[PDB]
Amino acid sequence: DRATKLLTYLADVTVNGHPEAKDRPKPLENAARPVVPYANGNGVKDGTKQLLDTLGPKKFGEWMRNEKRVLLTDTTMRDGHQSLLATRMRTYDIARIAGTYSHALPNLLSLECWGGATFDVSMRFLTEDPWERLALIREGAPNLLLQMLLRGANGVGYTNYPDNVVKYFVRQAAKGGIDLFRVFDCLNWVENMRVSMDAIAEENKLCEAAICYTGDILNSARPKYDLKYYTNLAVELEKAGAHIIAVKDMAGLLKPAAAKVLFKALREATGLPIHFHTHDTSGIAAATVLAAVEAGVDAVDAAMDALSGNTSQPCLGSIVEALSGSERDPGLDPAWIRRISFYWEAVRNQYAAFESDLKGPASEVYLHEMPGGQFTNLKEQARSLGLETRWHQVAQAYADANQMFGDIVKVTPSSKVVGDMALMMVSQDLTVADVVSPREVSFPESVVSMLKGDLGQPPSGWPEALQKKALKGEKPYTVRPGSLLKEADLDAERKVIEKKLEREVSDFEFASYLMYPKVFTDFALASDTYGPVSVLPTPAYFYGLADGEELFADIEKGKTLVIVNQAVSATDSQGMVTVFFELNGQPRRIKVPDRA
Amino acid sequence: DRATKLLTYLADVTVNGHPEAKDRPKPLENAARPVVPYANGNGVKDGTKQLLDTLGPKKFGEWMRNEKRVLLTDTTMRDGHQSLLATRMRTYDIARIAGTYSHALPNLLSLECWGGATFDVSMRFLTEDPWERLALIREGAPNLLLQMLLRGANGVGYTNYPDNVVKYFVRQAAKGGIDLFRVFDCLNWVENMRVSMDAIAEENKLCEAAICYTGDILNSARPKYDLKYYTNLAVELEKAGAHIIAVKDMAGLLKPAAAKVLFKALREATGLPIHFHTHDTSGIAAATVLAAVEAGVDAVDAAMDALSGNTSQPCLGSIVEALSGSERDPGLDPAWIRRISFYWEAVRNQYAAFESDLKGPASEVYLHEMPGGQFTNLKEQARSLGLETRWHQVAQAYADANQMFGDIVKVTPSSKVVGDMALMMVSQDLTVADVVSPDREVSFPESVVSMLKGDLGQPPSGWPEALQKKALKGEKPYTVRPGSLLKEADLDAERKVIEKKLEREVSDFEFASYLMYPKVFTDFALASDTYGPVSVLPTPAYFYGLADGEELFADIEKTLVIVNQAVSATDSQGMVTVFFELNGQPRRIKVPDRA
Amino acid sequence: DRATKLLTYLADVTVNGHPEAKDRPKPLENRPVVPYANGNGVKDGTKQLLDTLGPKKFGEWMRNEKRVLLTDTTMRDGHQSLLATRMRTYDIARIAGTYSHALPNLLSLECWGGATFDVSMRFLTEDPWERLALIREGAPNLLLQMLLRGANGVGYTNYPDNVVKYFVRQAAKGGIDLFRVFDCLNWVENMRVSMDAIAEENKLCEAAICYTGDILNSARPKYDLKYYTNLAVELEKAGAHIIAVKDMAGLLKPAAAKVLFKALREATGLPIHFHTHDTSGIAAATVLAAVEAGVDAVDAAMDALSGNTSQPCLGSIVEALSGSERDPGLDPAWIRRISFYWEAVRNQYAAFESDLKGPASEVYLHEMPGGQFTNLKEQARSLGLETRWHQVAQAYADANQMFGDIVKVTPSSKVVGDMALMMVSQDLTVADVVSPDREVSFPESVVSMLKGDLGQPPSGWPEALQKKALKGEKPYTVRPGSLLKEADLDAERKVIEKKLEREVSDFEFASYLMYPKVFTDFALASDTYGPVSVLPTPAYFYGLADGEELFADIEKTLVIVNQAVSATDSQGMVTVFFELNGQPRRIKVPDRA
């Protein structure tokens, strides 16, 4: 029956294709499968996981602060593929390499491997459970901190949730294996971060409170986001209970000379350790990261070579190589960094369907300030709307919409709002002047909503005139969104999803439902038809089995299925197709609909 | 295991197609299957079969003579598809209709249903046993005579065989269920017909000795085939022991005025009954048949409407309709004729692959004199050699070669010789003068060298010497009967050869097949072995296999229900697997991908 | 410009195909050649003899003639029967000279009338009067024969007396010498207008009696020997010069022919001309018996267009009579050479072949005329009855009994057709059709015939069926043209001349009077596309393949090469690059796909 269910999936995708893959480019037909590097069998060294369990988060941050070497966070398992492959990387590929990281790079601070768009995308587009993914990683790397990206009042969603839901989720993330929570608000509104921060502290995990970088601190013609804006935020986040301060440079806008000034200042204004996250859209983010190490930053993020560059993080292997032998040498073995990068390279070839056409660095990033994780998304969206050839006008409109909104921090969810506004302005051919003019504009939902106050408040408030015109008579609020949401009745809502599914659910599954009621529901129902598809290797997940193909699938840690596609019938008079399989040497037939 | 093998055949044809059909036109998709007409429930009336068993052949011939009504032979089961569908018609379709003939047309003289090209073609191209065919027809029609065409000293083959082989084969044919042997020699040489004639009489069957018609008795500028030529032959064939005399007009050349003269004179030269066979290539053979009837002929041949016309026999239904109510009305129910024709029409639709492009009558026949059963085949051969656009020149060369040979009777196997010469004349551009020229090297076809040597026998005036001398290249020709020169077959040694090759005993029928066609019978026995009793399959399944998801009913003994459920891709061993359900049970059959 | 028109046609069909040919079988991807004739001037024949004798003495000559006289029907019934009448003027004209030179003893070429008039214009875009003129020019020594449907002209309804008159007059002027005129119910009163108009032009009037049933079957007494003999006396009294037996369905059997033709030649002094079809596969038997019985003239088709629903084989009929007292005196070698031509021509019309495979004694049951049997099976396939075809044949026989047992030839055959189709289609039996309670909606063909628009059969129409078909309306048993008002030639002519903004010819006006809509459509098309009739048949039906070269004669020669063809452009127009006599031409046409 689980076997039967998987055969059903395999038949369905063999006959009909995967909706995400069928119409897109395909991997090279030769294609060597990824090979997990050889393990010497020696046990694993204690790392930052044991230190945090031993010290607790406050003393661990002081240990971080005092540490001479720069500490590294690998983002390959989350931001890397979120930025380069629409977050489509599968558990199967991610979990198989965690043991290798654990034996070979036991000095890493953390693996960023959870949250951001992975929570949603795993279920919606890959029919897999992000909790299982984390558990598998936890088991393979017991010595390293597992790090998530948590969106403050949005959790791992897009809307603000009620406080008790946010707390309920943090608590389950901590139980499920997350050690280090990097938490951010899309407007750097400290007030809107406290519920998250307190929940993290209550779980006794590391609360790395982020400040999003935007603008340019060394440009005096844009004083809004000057040095003291950042240093004051760091002082506030310390007062509000952070263990670590992050600079989250989501669009890769921080320049090297600015990093040098910024990280010296941050280290003097707060006693907390500092952690630097950037994107390489400009082609020079490695310079910014190295300037930051030289200026004393305690940790920095990077991605494995094979998933670095452009809108991802800059190259881990090369950054390490640049530091090798220096005072802040991170003590990471380049040869293992390369072997793991080769694994990721072969992994990534399986995901050709989701590659963008981005060719290289673009200084244009300094104009538009689109975050690395949005840039490609928004370009596809523009192609959807018939705007491929105006893409540069859309980028200009994004920059113009930014100023029109007051000049804001742009990062999920607020980036999305600036994107929609920009696309509107190009389609309907509007200047800033028209959008504000006393000229009807049917503003997008996302924009009305922000101006009402659903994403929070920026420093100097939303612009009066534009807010007036978009809201159309409706009154805005300036209080914290979550302060107005009804407390959910958890007992009750648990009973709802459990009635829907005709079965009890786990606390994790309930946390999923709370974050994504419909998506979790659809995923639960798909899991029920198709069984544990996460266990299939990637080619088979996306493309089924070629004629006569033999596949080995590990359905439980113990049990291997040997599955052969022996034949496929024509479509019968009822629109069904029968796939003839051999399953462990036994004949099986599965009918699936002809979805053509 | 018979079942396994039939599945194997079904798989092989489904995956690879049938050689004879895969690249030829196909039946229309809708295709009503042929339906055996509903039987009213009246018994089978005693007919000519019981009369023959009672009277013996000599007295049965006298009964034929004395009968007022013209007697009819239906040729649909042999000459009709031989002439129109390259003799590709299958036992499955032939045998299913015999019980109806038996119930509905009890007054028929005979069913022509065996011999000619059917013996070879059934094994070679249809994978089926001509003996089994004959047995199934015998069983379904116990009241009618079963008639074969036998080639004199050429048997059911194309070369004159040893005497003892001809005798053995005639013995097996009688025992297999043949009652009425139409026997002919391709040169009308009565001396080369004796052996066969004697062997038929010895089996106590009907010897219908034929005289092939050629030329024109009423054209005094072609006196060699004049009226006394035929009447003298009839007298000789009667003295040689015929029970019935046939006029075998293989190319449909006899014209109506001539029929009126010929049959009257025949019935005056001999007391034996006379049986007239012709072809409709001219578009007027029905006039000739009717003139023959009015002149007193005792029996005539025709074909069911749906397989009549052009190179076949003229239309049985319309001939009966014309005689209806006349003094010699044959007493055949035209409504039943039409019902049986409607069955043959649906049967014929399944053989769309073997239809020719011939559109209708041709007076050209009087020029070339190609036997009806050769025409389409020679034209396909011309096309093969690139001569399609020069077909009319091949026809003219065929007439020219005939005269060059001294003007001869042209029917298997002499017609083939003349065909070979004609094709060579057109390909190499040779007139008759070039062919016999002393300065022009000609490499005569083997069939021509052989006929001039004496292997097919002697025409009345011998062979033209200059032509003969040039073609033989110093080899000496002979004028004795060819059989007189052949080694008697050592039958016991030869039985052992075939039984050792097949690792088993063969029946006497089988051995007769072997004697006539050693390689073809051997290949057939080996195909039977791999594929089982494929003759039990309906014709569409036999030629095209089963379509995807198709359900088929097949009667081996027990009725198999076969469903093509799926066909694998070709594997690394070059094999394809067909997934059948056989009576609700899974069967997977591997056959090679022969592309 | 006349050429420019031609090029646009060629381009159009090259790009788009022909509506009549696009989804039908195609010819072997693999040339009709006109035979080299000796070079002789033509020998005088029947045309010169008619001019010398006039029609009455000409008929006497035929009677007295010992040799059987032969009419070749290849140019009309032959393709009408086997190829939906689709044969083109290019192929018909090109061989006229060869007949003239090689078979100068023939009585006539049946080459006009029947369905050719309608079909030439409606489906082939060519003028039947041009076709006639070209045949007349090519064969000035032979009689040209048309089939005329009496009060139906070349149409489907009885016309006004004066239309008929005008038409006969134009046919005579256009070059017809011999009018075979028939009435579809053998009603002599209805043939008078026709026959008198034929005599007034001083041409040959061969009044046909259509044959049906069976004279030697006494359980079918309605159509006995006396019926035929009496009708022959009546048609002589009416002024016929020749009497024809038109056996349109091929029903006459040889024993019948022996009795019939002896009796006919005793009943009348007039010569007798026998026309039959070969659907049975024995018609040549009947023809040959007609000849032994003294018949004066017989029709046959060239071999390659003979047999089945066409006429019986000419070559073989001739060959059968060769050396006899009545030997027709025709050279078998030239008969074959001409047949080889028609065979190479015929292959060009593969699109229009039926799937009829040979003889059918079923014809004795249903009596569908040859020229119908194909079309009606097509019409029945059309109505999802492919597999009830044998049921349709019973309905036709049943319906004909229901109609009183009548003569079925155009347009009554077409009537019986529609009734048969409805009966199988609406699953109805003769008992149902004419029942009191059961509601039927009879075809407009049937309603009209029971009204009397096609004339009156012997005993008249069965009272019961007529009254229910009628639905209240009253029948008339008066001859239809004694009701139709005379047409205003002067005024009806202004209508076509002002619809066309041209003067038209008397020939055109005649076409218009016979087929108003069909003539007008043809005029437009002619204007659009030019003299398409001068195109060889493969180019007419399929256009020109890439790189192909083509010769055609606009006045009494163009070299046209298809150089290239562009894709379809923004306006849906395609461009075909041509070389006309060495010079470049681009011709645009719409992509109608």
Ligand SMILES: O=C(O)CCCC[C@@H]1SC[C@@H]2NC(=O)N[C@@H]21
């Ligand atoms: O990919 C998803 O959204 C979850 C699974 C739902 C659709 C499956 S994927 C294989 C098969 N092919 C289709 O097009 N639909 C089903």
Ligand SMILES: O=C(O)CCCC[C@@H]1SC[C@@H]2NC(=O)N[C@@H]21
């Ligand atoms: O061709 C024959 O009639 C008899 C010999 C057997 C050959 C068989 S027919 C089906 C299958 N397809 C092939 O081409 N070969 C085999």
Ligand SMILES: O=C(O)CCCC[C@@H]1SC[C@@H]2NC(=O)N[C@@H]21
């Ligand atoms: O008008 C005619 O000649 C009779 C048939 C109509 C077809 C012509 S052929 C060129 C063009 N292609 C079409 O489909 N319509 C016209």
Ligand SMILES: [Cl-]
């Ligand atoms: Cl959701």
Ligand SMILES: [Cl-]
């Ligand atoms: Cl052999």
Ligand SMILES: [Mg+2]
């Ligand atoms: Mg430090």
Ligand SMILES: [Mg+2]
């Ligand atoms: Mg007798």
Ligand SMILES: [Mg+2]
């Ligand atoms: Mg005469």
Ligand SMILES: [Zn+2]
């Ligand atoms: Zn990021």
Ligand SMILES: [Zn+2]
């Ligand atoms: Zn024969």
Ligand SMILES: [Zn+2]
């Ligand atoms: Zn006719």
